[model samples]
Target chain A: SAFITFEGPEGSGKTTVINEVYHRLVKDYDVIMTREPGGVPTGEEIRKIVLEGNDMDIRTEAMLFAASRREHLVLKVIPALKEGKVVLCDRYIDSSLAYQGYARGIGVEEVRALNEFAINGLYPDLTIYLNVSAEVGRERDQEDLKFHEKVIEGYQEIIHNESQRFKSVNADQPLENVVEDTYQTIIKYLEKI
Target chain B: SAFITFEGPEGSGKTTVINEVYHRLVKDYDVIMTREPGGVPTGEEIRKIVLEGNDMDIRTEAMLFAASRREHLVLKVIPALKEGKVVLCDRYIDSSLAYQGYARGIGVEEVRALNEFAINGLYPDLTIYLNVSAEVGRERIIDQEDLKFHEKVIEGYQEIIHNESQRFKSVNADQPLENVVEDTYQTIIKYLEKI
Candidate 1:
């Protein structure tokens, strides 16, 4: 009984780690790994707006994300979970909280309120946050410096606020170590469930 | 100083009335008229999904509408209102309330909450509801097997108007087209005078 999610700043090895997790989990369980801003037909349409569209209002961006999230959750995530598959999502609510809410200055609670409506209160059972410094991530991905800094702060606040559901893996470590840490954490958690 | 909206069943002459109203008002005031599911480019994209996309969940449809409405408002409606133009919209929140909330059983409050988030509490200054019976609307549109749904929509608007009396004024759209147009013109004239 787990709706597992992977969240982190860019170049935190989340994609690599999630792939390894999927490869490992599929051998044992019915596991389906997916990413967001996409995962369904309508979500793909919304993704083009988010990724390629220009000069959008901040609130409009927020609404688009919420719309896409609702579609993805209802169409993909919920269905996978219902069939008792290990639904490993690449990113969920925290990305919006960090990027749009904190970095873009829309207020985290306001964004959270909209997302709450979008997801219909479907919080992940487990969130594995790949913790890394902005400097480390920036060196790896070459993202905008200021935005990366805010994203780190946003993740910090989320981790501080949510302790039980959030499991942090030190992403500043070597790639193998981070993946192993994440794998072990999931294994330990899944044992209990 | 008005954000006027026109709302009713499909064949209730909203398009004709709105065009007539626009033509009459353009001589005296800066009027910009548009319709929902589209007004801006992003809204047009969302409209394609709503109209043509199939097998969508009802909640997804609601969210898509809210997204489109948000884009339309921020890009077009709010800007038009800011410039002191009388923004006459074809349909707004009430259509969602009637069709999705009442008829589709999504719950009025649930849909309203999402739309409230979308609009950020921007209510219409005046909503001219073209009142018509479901049979009349069905005959004009030739949409069979949905008369009962249209009737529920009519009741939904009446309930909405009753609650927000200050913002709504009903017009019996069953009357002759020219007579209805004249009555609407008079109402707009009186409203503009008050401001």
Candidate 2:
């Protein structure tokens, strides 16, 4: 199973790059691209709960995400992987680590443990980190700049800790450059394997 | 905060007994009675997911329960406890232990760990076990009784009780409802005084 995940703060151009990568990969390989808090009926239902903003506790938020991830993994990702397809996910376990674990002040290890239980043994083979400053993302949305900094910081720490499976790309560059860099990273991994 | 939980197999007359006990307790203490997979908006949302009965995996089911429980505790149970109220939950962690942990074949310890994370140190001060044979309950739910399933549930409760005897009091739910209610009330009274 060739499992790859794209991770970063919002407006980092992951969605655009991943979509282009998916279209290109489908030409030569059996590929399936999906996103978290969705991909299955149950997970889509969970997605509504998560996205409907309210006064949710931090732990509750983490747990709901884990629950949705479990359903998505079991129903969608695992099956595609077993058939020897390339599973390209928009976000995975690392998103929880960055957004909930670090930015939200829940311990990274705690959230990681919960997600590990949820994922079981099916971990991503390659995690492509679209490295962009939090300020740049906040600039796109005019959201909390300080919070985006924490999010960027969280991704940096995660990338440092697990460099073996993570490939960092400068998403601050032009769209074509970001797309080419991500494509090459995937190609290199595929060639080596 | 003095927290108490009610646990037993289905048809143990727990609903009637707990309601009767709740009315009595409210007279003397600031009592908050509630149940799981619910008690708050988020929990109620998760409750719909659990009960809708899709072909959900066993682990997914367990995780959903834990998620709902986390919300319920944070939003409702913990606040009431901090206010020094007598919080009487109709079903708490033990229901998960019996149904999901034992009956569903997910090991008890794993489910306990998940729940411990969800609870975050707010354990029930007293867990009142309404002891009843599973066969009796099965007869009530359906005519043809499945003994093995309920037997496993009972065993799960026993194992939990033995592990923490100091925190548990078993009430013979096979007795008359009034008698069971009286026994439960007495136990609650005794435990409350010590607190």
Candidate 3:
């Protein structure tokens, strides 16, 4: 399946931009735009554990996210891919890499490995990493003292490192400019592949 | 912390026998009876996903159980033991090893590895394996059709034989003598360090 995933901190304007990009792409092509635990009912149920703030071990948190990812892929992502539909997923394994790994101290390699096991070598054909400084991100959205620090720190680590399969977009620019830049990046990469 | 666990097939009368042993022990000492997702607010929530037959991946199922186990240990089981309470767990890693690993095709060594990582080697001093035939275990459960056939039975059988704990007990007895009386006595003599 042609899969695209979005990755950034909580305040990176991902929601607005993803919708903007999704609508533009929808006219001529078959498309589905969703976030994690959204594709299938089974995976959706599991999303509650990760997002709802359970007193779970860090590793447990990583595993639950991976579990939810696996179900989403099986029930939704794969079927669309088989039919040659473009599947756009917001906040897939990258979020786990950021949130559970560096931020939560669960070890990035461990979370990545679990996600790798979950996805079975299926990397998103294109990953748009909307890079923004933690300061700029927190400014855009009012910060919750508990999780904002971690989210920003986690995404910063992703931006600084080049090991993952992603293309970085400067999200600090004007909203319209950022959307345009993100769109062009996707187009260039898709053409190159 | 001193932790002891009981493990066996469903119909082996583990619940009844363990309850009898728990009451008998509780009379003399403060004992905690814990099962998976044990009473902790968070664990109880996760328990629903693990126990329910949802469309979760097998490996995912294994992971959630591990997560649930970790919460139970940290939030409930460990604090009680720190207070010097004797912890009598109804089922521990062995149940996962038997039920999820061998029987469910998840592989014993793999499930054992995850559980070891989950618990960080916090095992019971003793484990009571109630030996029961496949037929007998199936008969005890209200619905035999709902459970796995050969694998569940073999998982229990093989894990006991392979375990390293010197405090393992097997109770295959007649109608008169209570299973708990003899087994508990043996466990005390084996693991209880005398003052």
The estimated TM-scores of all candidates read: 0.91, 0.92, 0.81
What is the per-residue lDDT of model 2 for residues B11-118, given as tens digits with 9 covering 90 to 100?
Answer: 788889999999998899899888875558788888888888477887778888888888888778888888989999988888887778887878788778767767
Looking at candidate 3 chain A, the ten consecutive residues that score lowest on lDDT are A141-150
lDDT, candidate 3, B83-119, per-residue tens: 9887888878877777667777777777777676568
Off by over 4 Å in 1: A37-39, A141-143, B37-39, B143-145
Point out the higher-scoring one by TM-score: 1 or 3.
Answer: 1
Question: What alpha-carbon RMSD in Å does predicted model 2 have with respect to the real structure?
Answer: 2.3
DockQ comparisons of all candidates to the true complex = 0.57, 0.57, 0.32
Quote the chain B TM-score of every prediction: 0.94, 0.93, 0.84
Q: Relative to the true structure, how large is the alpha-carbon lDDT of every model? A: 0.84, 0.85, 0.73
Q: List the residue pairs that clash in candidate 1.
A: none
Residue-by-residue lDDT tens digits, candidate 3, A104-167: 8776776676677578678888888888776787778333644667776777666677545688
- Sorted into a CAPRI-style docking class, model 1 comes out as medium
